[PDB]
Subunit: 83 residues, 4 copies
């Protein structure tokens, strides 16, 4: 799979995660984007997390949609700037 295609998939994940957290959990756009990166990179500081049952379900789908996508994107990025 082309790295740029994976990059586009990661951007879609970011939009989905950001907009979802902002609207379900009510956090600002900036915090929501930050939470999304922290979640799909599997850092998970826990300074922000879902507090509603819907937010919890949404976080689970984000985790499933976002973690593999993100990992492959960083590794393809690695290859690109180094090799």
């Amino acid at each position: 799979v082309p790295a740029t295609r994976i990059l586009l998939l990661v951007l879609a994940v970011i939009i989905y995660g950001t907009a979802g957290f902002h609207f379900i959990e009510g956090e600002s756009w900036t915090v929501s984007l930050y939470w999304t990166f922290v979640t799909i990179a599997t850092v998970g500081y826990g300074d922000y997390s879902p507090h509603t049952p819907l937010g919890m379900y949404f976080t689970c789908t984000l985790i499933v949609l976002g973690i593999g996508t993100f990992a492959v994107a960083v590794e393809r990025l690695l290859e690109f700037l180094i090799n």
Copy 2:
């Protein structure tokens, strides 16, 4: 190994983690499921975590049983929807 078989292994992990946290730690079903995903994806927000020695031991076994299973499942899912 067939991806669907791995999927079944991940579902068993989810049941084990969810039921275990609910009964050992006393959290709701919804929170327990959310905690299980957050744990085996290695996100670990720490909004929920075990507070008993048994919960701690159980979390260690879940970690060992669940993390590799989950990682292989997301990567097989990746291959499937993209390739």
Copy 3:
């Protein structure tokens, strides 16, 4: 590398992490073991973490010594029980 050898390396990491956290940070044996697994699996709930400069340095060495070791062990375990 033989999986059992990797298993032995992971056990040494666990002893090192557990004893180190217990003595540097002053937490119980049980909590220290739990913290060690949570750290080297990269879950990191943050219910426990080092509070001293030495604990912080020690956690960094544990991270470096433990994360790769643990990841290879779970993946070799995966191969073993499934294949």
Copy 4:
């Protein structure tokens, strides 16, 4: 890619992360270094995290620059001391 080159890339990431957190977030040098390792190893205890919009953006770039770099370095280190 030579492991030592990757090691140098990881050292640059550590400097960037440490100095960035110290100056953007105002934490000590020691805490900033500890936070950097905890972040790029994807442990993320959340005992420390950015509290400003700039700190949040910076953490996102660190995550992107640091996570793949760190993972490849630990795995190359693994090969080296074991094989």
